[PDB]
Structure 1
């Protein structure tokens, strides 16, 4: 689809067997999901942006369904107020910016 940017580009994702709203985020390297349980091994990570850094749990090889499109990749879980789909997954979906 073509998403206009008048409003937040929010989409419904599916991850860990749960439906969620998430922000399509071209300015995010990583995909960051509000704290939840995911299966498999994880390791700690520090990620930053405006306002400094938060500590998160990194899970690798995680399937996510993004607006109906399946993709697999690393997923970060932590204290974010907004679920964020970053470039690591937006590429798998073939998302581009156009103007």
Structure 2
């Protein structure tokens, strides 16, 4: 689909069998979601935002569906204000910016 930007580009994602709302964010290097349980081991990671840095948990090779498109990749879990789909997964679903 073609998504205009008059409103937030919010989509439904499915992760761990649950539906959640997330924002398609070209300004985010990686994907970060609010607290939830994910399988496997995690690694430490620091990500920087407008307000400063936060610690997150990095989970690898996580199955995630984005607006019905199947992706498998890195998902960070932490104190984010909104669920964000970053470039690591936008590239998997073949998302580009056009003007």
Q: Same fold (TM over 0.5)?
A: yes
Distance 1:57 1:7 in 2: 30
Question: How far apart are 1:91 and its partner, in Å?
Answer: 0.4
SS in structure 2 opposite 1:56?
strand
Instruction: Tell me the number of residue pairs that the alignment of Structure 1 and Structure 2 aligns.
Output: 99
* Distance in 2, Cα, partners of 1:41 & 1:49: 25
Say whether residues 1:17 and 2:6 are aligned partners: no
**Cα deviations by residue, 1:21-60 (Å, 9 ceiling, x for unpaired):** 0000000001000011100110111111211011100000
Q: TM-score, normalised by structure 2?
A: 0.98
Query: What CA RMSD, in Å, does the superposition of the two structures yield over aligned residues?
Result: 0.5
Secondary structure of 1:88's counterpart equals helix
Q: Take 1:87 and 1:40, find their aligned partners in 2: how far apart are those partners?
A: 23
Match of 1:32 in 2: 32
Segments of 5+ residues of structure 1 without an aligned counterpart are none
Structure 2 runs not aligned, ≥5 long: none
* CA distance in 1: counterparts of 2:5 and 2:72, whole angstroms: 26
C-alpha separation between the residues in 2 aligned to 1:92 and 1:34?
Answer: 21
Partner of 1:87: 87
